Design a protein around this ligand. Sequence first.
Ligand code: ZN
Ligand code: ZN
Ligand code: ZN
Ligand code: ZN
Ligand code: ZN
Ligand code: ZN
Lengths: 165, 169
Amino acid sequence: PEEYLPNIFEGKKGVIVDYGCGNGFYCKYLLEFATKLYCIDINVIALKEVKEKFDSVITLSDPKEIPDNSVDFILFANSFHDMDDKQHVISEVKRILKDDGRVIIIDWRKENTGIGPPLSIRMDEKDYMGWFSNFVVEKRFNPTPYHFGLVLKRKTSEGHHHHHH
Amino acid sequence: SLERPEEYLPNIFEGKKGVIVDYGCGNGFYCKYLLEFATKLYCIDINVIALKEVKEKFDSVITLSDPKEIPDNSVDFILFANSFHDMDDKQHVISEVKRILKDDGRVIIIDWRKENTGIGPPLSIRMDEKDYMGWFSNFVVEKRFNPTPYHFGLVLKRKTSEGHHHHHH
Ligand SMILES: [Zn+2]
Ligand SMILES: [Zn+2]
Ligand SMILES: [Zn+2]
Ligand SMILES: [Zn+2]
Ligand SMILES: [Zn+2]
Ligand SMILES: [Zn+2]
C-alpha cells in the first residue's frame, strides 16, 4: 500500500476523501498526504472506530457538507460496487472534486479469486467507466494479484462549465 | 465594533481550550476570537453565502449547514451569538445541542436585551433570559455577563440529573 499510493499522491498533498471507508484500512496511509481527510460511510459503527483512532479525520455519513470544488483526491477502496445510490454518488463526486482533481479506484478483479466477495457483486474497469462516464483513466496499477487500480481524471470539456466553484 | 469580545470571551474559555461550535455564525464575527481557543471549530449557518465567507477567511473551520454530522457527546462549548431568536426549528436545535454537547459542556448565549435600544433587531423578535430558559430548560445559568450595554450574556450548564442518563456517548 506504501507500494502504490505514494506514486499517486507523491507530487501533490491536499484534500482527500476516503469514500466508503468501512474497514478503515486506507486511512493511516492517507493521513500522511492529507491537508484534510474526510471519511464517508453509511455504517455508523465503522465511523466511530475511525474517530476513536484518528481525531483529525472529519467523519461524515454523506458528502453533503463537503464544500463544492474543494477536493483533490477521492478514493473508493473496494467500496463502490455495493454502495447505495450510485447516481447520487457520482453526482456528489462531480460536485466536490476540483477541476484538476483525481478519483482513485481500487476494487476486486472480476474473476473467481476464491477469497473476497461474491462474483456477482464484482465490477471491472469497463463497469466503472460506465458510472464514471465523465472521466478517463490516466494510470493503472496492481495493489495485489486479486485487485486492480485506476487513477481517473475528468474528460477535458469544451461546452459550458456548469460545475460551481 | 459595538461588541469587543476580547473583554468577555477569555474569562469564559481560559481554563478550557476545546471543541467549540459557533451555532448561527452568520457574519463570522466571532470566529477569530474563537480560533484562539478551539481544538476544533465548527461554524453552523443555514445561510450558504455566510458560510462561504467563513471558508474564504478561516480554512481550519468546519462549516456546516446544520449540526447533524457533528458527533454525539463531542463538544465543550456552543455559542449562540445573537442568533437563536430567529433560528428555524428551535426544538430541533435544543435537541441537537443536547446530543452533541458533553456532560460537562457549556452553552454561551449572547443576545440583545428585550427593550427598545434603538439599535438592533426589531423588539418583537427578541428574547430575554427568561425566554432563553424556556427553551434551554434542561440547563441552568452558571454565570451572567454584559458584553455591551444593549446585550446580555449567559453561560449555561446542564441541570444535574438523578435518573437515567439516555444521552448517548
Ligand atoms: Zn469503538
Ligand atoms: Zn436510495
Ligand atoms: Zn469546475
Ligand atoms: Zn466570498
Ligand atoms: Zn422546520
Ligand atoms: Zn451524557
